[PDB]
Design a protein around this ligand. Structure first.
Ligand SMILES: [K+]
Ligand SMILES: [K+]
Ligand SMILES: [K+]
Ligand SMILES: [K+]
Ligand SMILES: [Mg+2]
Ligand SMILES: [Mg+2]
Ligand SMILES: [Mg+2]
Ligand SMILES: [Mg+2]
Ligand SMILES: [Mg+2]
Lengths: 70, 102
RNA sequence: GGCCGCAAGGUUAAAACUCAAAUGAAUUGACGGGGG
RNA sequence: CGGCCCCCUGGACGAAGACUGACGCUCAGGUGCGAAAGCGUGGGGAGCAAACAGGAUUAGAUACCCUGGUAGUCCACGCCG
């Protein structure tokens, strides 16, 4: 019953405090992203230069949730 | 007798020592600038500088990130120091650059 | 802001904002580069 | 507040009486006193010692350790509170 989330790919440019990250997407836009609850429960570390999948929402195109680290 | 005197006059030359500074791949600007002032001091006093850079875990995947720090240090101390052992590969979980005065 | 002081500063003394705690004593463990 | 001696001087306590006759208790403002560091103006300076200088230790060591060392610590008068 929820609205759909578009998933994009991107690179981690910068680690910010408390599981927050600047991520450049393929389109060229930088977004501030936070780790998903699955990834933090299962201890999947994210670092600078990592490639990630970012769930975005149409309500705010400056924010995202990192849902996978390749 | 004595000559100890003459030794003291010979001693007021110099002995070179090696001062180790250790960076990391992610080290912020302020904290970089502190460690640079340590190196400037050592080199202006005529001492060698063993600049290390360590990696942990999966920081080794992004080796290129670490390399640029050592390149940044080198280019900031270009006028003061000469390079003596610019690294090639990660030996262990470390890379070691050695600088020297002038 | 007032008063005091050569100065350092002292004294009198708020509000916006933010949090659901902060705190005292005692209890059972664990820990100590404390003791036996 | 600590050697000994002299000079000036404040309070406390005990024993027996005599005397005054509630003259008391507490105190906002006020006034005084108030460790050490610190400040001003003059002195003094053995020992000690912020700052500082050198020697070390260390991944680094603007420290702890070592050799030195100025203010200060002492005196008079004032301030500070
Ligand atoms: K004031
Ligand atoms: K409050
Ligand atoms: K014990
Ligand atoms: K002196
Ligand atoms: Mg007396
Ligand atoms: Mg004093
Ligand atoms: Mg004085
Ligand atoms: Mg001394
Ligand atoms: Mg000393």
């Amino acid at each position: 019953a929820k609205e759909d989330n578009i998933e994009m790919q991107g690179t981690v440019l910068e680690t910010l405090p408390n599981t927050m990250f600047r991520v450049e997407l393929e389109n060229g836009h930088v977004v501030t992203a936070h780790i998903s609850g699955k990834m933090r429960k299962n201890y999947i570390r994210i670092l600078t230069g990592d490639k990630v999948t970012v769930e975005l929402t149409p309500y705010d195109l400056s924010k995202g949730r990192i849902v996978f680290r390749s | 007798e004595k000559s100890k005197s003459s030794k003291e006059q010979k001693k007021k030359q110099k002995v070179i020592q090696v001062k180790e500074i250790k960076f990391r791949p992610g080290t912020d600007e302020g904290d970089y600038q502190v460690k640079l002032r340590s190196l400037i001091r050592f080199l202006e006093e005529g001492d060698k500088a063993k600049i290390t850079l360590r990696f942990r875990g999966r920081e080794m995947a992004h080796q290129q990130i670490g390399m640029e720090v050592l390149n940044r240090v080198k280019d900031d101390l270009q006028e003061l120091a000469v390079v003596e052992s610019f690294p090639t590969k990660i030996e262990g979980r470390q890379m070691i650059m050695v600088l020297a005065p002038k």
